[PDB]
């Protein structure tokens, strides 16, 4: 399970070495002057399978690196100026949204807290953020499986992160 471009480089280079050894064995066989091309095609198809697996691992690593580096930026947003204290509070709210909202009551409570916090500024983004908060609140109050409120929760989290990554809303975002 890779996470670094260096480890991906290692995987790529060892795969290329494997390709070279396989084709060298095929060539040094020195036989099947008509099945040689079929063996070459099969070898290339094997290569394609492995490259697609590497691509899948790359997608997973990119997503996990994105999440980890957002958390890292939130941490660097903390390391006792009042702006940094507000940043720590917003980090707490973001972690509350991040954690698996396994309980509907705590879900509603944290949504209430973040709605109170957001409703202070109200220029353009809070309209859609409040709309999404009310959407989740209603679809939990009437009673629907939270496992079906996955994309909507993702959208709330994304909009809240975009709200945090803003100068006026978080009065230190000029850093990044």
């Amino acid at each position: 399970h890779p996470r670094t471009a260096a480890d991906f480089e290692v995987l790529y280079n060892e795969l290329e070495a494997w390709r070279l050894q396989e084709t060298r064995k095929i060539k040094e066989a020195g036989l099947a002057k008509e099945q040689e091309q079929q063996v070459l095609q099969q070898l290339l198809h094997k290569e394609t399978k492995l490259l697609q697996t590497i691509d899948r691992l790359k997608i997973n690593a990119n997503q996990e690196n994105k999440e980890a580096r957002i958390q890292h930026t939130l941490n660097e947003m903390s390391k006792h100026t009042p702006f940094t204290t507000r940043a720590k509070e917003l980090q707490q709210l973001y972690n509350g949204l991040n954690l698996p909202l396994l309980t509907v009551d705590e879900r509603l409570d944290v949504l209430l807290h973040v709605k109170w916090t957001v409703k202070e500024f109200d220029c353009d983004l809070t309209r859609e953020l409040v709309d999404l908060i009310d959407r989740e609140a209603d679809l939990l109050n009437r009673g629907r499986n939270p496992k079906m409120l996955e994309g909507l929760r993702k959208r709330i989290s994304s909009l809240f992160l975009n709200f945090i990554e803003t100068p006026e809303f978080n009065p230190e975002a000029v850093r990044f």
Binding site: G151, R155, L159
Partner: protein, 50 residues
Amino acid sequence: NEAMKGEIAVTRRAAYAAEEAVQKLEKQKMEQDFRIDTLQDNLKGTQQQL
């Protein structure tokens, strides 16, 4: 009592149809929510590129 039981059965089936329709609509709603998420991610990326 016979007519009342018939009405009970009809109303019960109507309620179950409503439930299944809501389930299907919720699935479609979640798919559209994924779509909105993707179209917002692309917009943020393009803004940063600009």
